Symmetry: C3
Subunit: 250 residues, 3 copies
Amino acid sequence: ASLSFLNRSELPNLAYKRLKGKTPGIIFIPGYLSNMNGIKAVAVEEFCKSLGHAFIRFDYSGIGSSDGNLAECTVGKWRKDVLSILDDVAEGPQILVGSSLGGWLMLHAAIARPEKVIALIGIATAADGLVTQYHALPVETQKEIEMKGEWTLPSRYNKEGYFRIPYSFIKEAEHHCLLHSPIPVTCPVRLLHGMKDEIVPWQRSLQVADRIVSPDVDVILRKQGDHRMKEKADIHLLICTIDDLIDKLS
Amino acid sequence: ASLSFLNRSELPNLAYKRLKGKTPGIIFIPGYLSNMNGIKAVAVEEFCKSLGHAFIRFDYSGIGSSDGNLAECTVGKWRKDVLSILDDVAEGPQILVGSSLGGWLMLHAAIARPEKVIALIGIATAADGLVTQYHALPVETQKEIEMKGEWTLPSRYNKEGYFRIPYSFIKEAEHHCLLHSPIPVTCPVRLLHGMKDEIVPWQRSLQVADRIVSPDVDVILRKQGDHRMKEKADIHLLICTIDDLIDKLS
Amino acid sequence: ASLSFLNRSELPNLAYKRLKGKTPGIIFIPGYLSNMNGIKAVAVEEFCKSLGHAFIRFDYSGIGSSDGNLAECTVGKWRKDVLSILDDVAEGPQILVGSSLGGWLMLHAAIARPEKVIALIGIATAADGLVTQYHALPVETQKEIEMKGEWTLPSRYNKEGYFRIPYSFIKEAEHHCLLHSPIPVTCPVRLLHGMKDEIVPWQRSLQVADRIVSPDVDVILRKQGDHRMKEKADIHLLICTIDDLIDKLS
Ligand SMILES: [Sr+2]
Ligand SMILES: [Sr+2]
Ligand SMILES: [Sr+2]
Ligand SMILES: [Sr+2]
Ligand SMILES: [Sr+2]
Ligand SMILES: [Sr+2]
Ligand SMILES: [Sr+2]
Ligand SMILES: [Sr+2]
Ligand SMILES: [Sr+2]
Ligand SMILES: [Sr+2]
Ligand SMILES: [Sr+2]
Ligand SMILES: [Sr+2]
């Protein structure tokens, strides 16, 4: 699909690619600092094309082809980005497919738009992101990060291109945490997670499943899966999950 | 009712006329290139005045008293116009009355706002507008329109003041077609159609009725009715339909 | 909580104070010309802090720390202010606590956002405000106010700092009256009212209760309560009402 832009007033314009077709549509919500051109996004687009269903992928504010100053971006702004795509680009019932951060944000979207969002598929769902890990750190480290103004990440995160996080970003993200309360999502949910995920522990998907009020939640745990879940077999699992969900919803 | 304007940010301001009264209110959504001063709109306003119910009529972007450059208007922009009236002017439960294009757009509005829209009445509902006819044309004609950049309409459309349509407008309108999928409208629907309609075939209303998920859909076919459905007897049918629906909803 | 601002496009920015915590959150909607620093608002914030629940208080356009020209403010604009806080600041399920005008506006908010608003608590709910009293006045007085352009209020209103009201404000407020129709609120509602309220008669809360479609409405009438309901015992009643409702909703 070719490049379009959503004009927003007093918020940065968002770049997106849209495929015409049947509803329910699919919206792909990417991972942290990921643009819409990744392996999973493109694979989901090609599957929707073969099924004849509508599809949207897009770039967060500050990322890829979208407008915005990445230095000022926050989880809260990216949450509103998802809502802008859902409200102003998508029409009719939608299945959300969210990777990592995108899985955190798809939950917010389903809470906010319970009529329009008819199912959720998460991949390595990063609910409550790094706020969880920040608050598990010893208090002295928490005060060191605050004084420094940034958290320099453990080396395992460097393998994915993550290195530093501002203190202000962590504190803003606290407003968007969900695991301290029931998650009022009432639609079907499928949560895929690799058990060798070194960024988001697989147990996070079980915590999300437990908090979701919907009784219809499955967690699919892949023994040798890592955080990106983009090997050929992992793409096949994602496509099968989408195909089975569309069938069930029909 | 006297003339008011809805201020929108980075979208053209919309002209509307609003009558105070009881809810459910009625919103009249006009036909293609029709302003809010037509026979049916004024008749519905007078009926709501006699019943004591709230009522809104308005002009699409680019039309009548509204702002906007008509040359840049699209079905997608007019869809958002309807949503702007429903969100920013109307308060409480609404019955939508849509004529021609307005009947296509009322479906979008009910899909998008299922809590607020409590019933639909369509008149010569132009679901999927002229996209249907464009794609039924032979392929060579489709390429001729694309090369020319406009579709010069069959003469029968000239009788209503329709002559030419840009290719770009047709392709944008493809994003808003509904008949390829279930239409997730769950409220009562009444679809009036003249069987001698030379612009939108009466069978279109049966197709819409079949796709609507709501079990409560009636199609009223008037043997000698034409596209505008504005003879005195057709106005009486419309008012009776509104009155009977308000009674049923009470 | 410390002072934040909601940026709105082509509407005045709103000042608010937000407390992080569990959902359901609470939003306090203040009385006419009241800022967010009143006794009840602060008491509800302290209770939410002790319970660990999220909380928002805010200033209407034109009031307190918010932007806006108070001379141009209307009930309709303040209604949209409430919706802006609910949409753009609050996340997840909310209990609305509305005092006086705020109780009128919380009803609008629950009508407009039936998924997000999960309960209502009103204090001296001023449904249909002073429109009711204006239209009970003799016709000659109504024409005198119209010619003068303002209504100089009975002296009993002066005790609360209310003196004059523009005619234009009264007529705009007619658009937001609710008691002429069923009130399509479907959540639990608790309406507190002092029987010695000289500003809003206690019977107004019974009228609201009767019009609300929800079967789950209680009216709590305090024999010696006045309009502000801010004595220590009235604060205790409000906190107990919130605590009992959160328990019931859990
Ligand atoms: Sr812009
Ligand atoms: Sr850039
Ligand atoms: Sr800790
Ligand atoms: Sr299969
Ligand atoms: Sr404007
Ligand atoms: Sr013009
Ligand atoms: Sr064809
Ligand atoms: Sr009758
Ligand atoms: Sr602004
Ligand atoms: Sr000021
Ligand atoms: Sr009277
Ligand atoms: Sr107790």
